Amino acid sequence: IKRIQDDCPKAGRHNYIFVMIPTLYSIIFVVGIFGNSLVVIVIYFYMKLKTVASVFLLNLALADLCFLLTLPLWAVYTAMEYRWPFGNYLCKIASASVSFNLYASVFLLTCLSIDRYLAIVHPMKSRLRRTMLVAKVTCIIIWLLAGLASLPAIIHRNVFFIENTNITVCAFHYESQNSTLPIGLGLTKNILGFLFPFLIILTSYTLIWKALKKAYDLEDNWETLNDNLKVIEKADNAAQVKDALTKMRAAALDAQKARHGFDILVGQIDDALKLANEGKVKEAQAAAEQLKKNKPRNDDIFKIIMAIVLFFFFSWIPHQIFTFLDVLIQLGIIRDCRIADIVDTAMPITICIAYFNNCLNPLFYGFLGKKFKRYFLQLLK
């Protein structure tokens, strides 16, 4: 193999890392194999793939299982103080499997979020364009775009013999001069692997947020009119009628700001306000009674949309920042071996956060479906 020299040989070589990080990879392995296997068993065998979201959720669990197969290799690798005994062929597959799963899992969530924007906001107009054939062709393109993105992890990932410590490792060699590796390889994982997809994931669920808000606020406006109309019928003085009629005029304007006679209702409420203000109590109740039910509603859907976005953001944002810090060292913006140590120490920590939350994504998205939750609890019971 090749014999190279490490600029900062003591960077990232800490005993608490060589003991804790392999333990974390074991926790991710057992939980990941357990959770992602049940997702495949429930979807592919108990539901037979009947929707577009089921195709994405199936491939989201299959992609995580492929990454978990290479996880025991990295566990014993970090356990032996970064020593690679599996050869040069097994590293190119392992390093590609991690890069492949990063792009694939994030691309699937991007398309799954776009599917939710169309299924909730445009149910009738986007149904003929969202079929089973489209979901399968979308996934095979995602497999190609992820494999194309993990392509440098197959070409430039070689096994090197470090002469400083006589330790055989596999890595990218950020040569100071005459390097065949691309300059900004970590930049691709930033924009293509996080920045661009997150802005689509954030935009999709924000439009779902705004659509459900206009629909829920409209129902509360109608519920305000009906509840206040019953207050006027049960009122006994002009003060109670004045309070309910003012709340109905305000609710009519909010319901109008969601071509017809909304000004007719608002004008007739304003006519009733002219009677209740002049001490007339019985006359205002007659005009209110002359003017003027079981829809599903989940007021906790906004907490769900909030959790979905922040779970994708806070899980990847530790790994994507130190990835960007790795690029600054590669370009030559920073050459200090002190900041290279805090980057080499925090990289195993961020991977244990991003890839642990990512292996629980097919399980969390499954529990949102009421039918999926039914089959999942039957297997455990």
Epitope: T51, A53, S54, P123, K293, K295, P296, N298, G369, K371
Partner: nanobody
Framework: QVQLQESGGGLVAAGGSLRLSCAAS????????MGWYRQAPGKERELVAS???????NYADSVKGRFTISRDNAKNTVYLAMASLKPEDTAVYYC????????????????????WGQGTQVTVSS
Amino acid sequence: QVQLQESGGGLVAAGGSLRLSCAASGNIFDVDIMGWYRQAPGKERELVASITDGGSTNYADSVKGRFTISRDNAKNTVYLAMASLKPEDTAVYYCAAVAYPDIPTYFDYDSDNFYWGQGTQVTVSS
């Protein structure tokens, strides 16, 4: 399951009139949005009209001004009043509806909260 029963189809001469009906059954809560789809022979399916629980309607450009869709939220039924029928309108008309369960998480890996009907034939001779 939320089933959809259709009725009103038949063979009529060119320029006649029909009224397609579709009532939703098997639902505990009100159906959200209902519409009509048709599939001409040898061509892909297309959306004809759709009406929401609020009353907003959306028609296609080929049936605009001729068809009139309506619904009765009490019985969860949708009526498609077809007038000035053309020989191009000869197709099988399908009824579609969107219905969410109680406390809807707006996710469904079984039916996507979307339900179809059997379909009724509508033929128009020139």
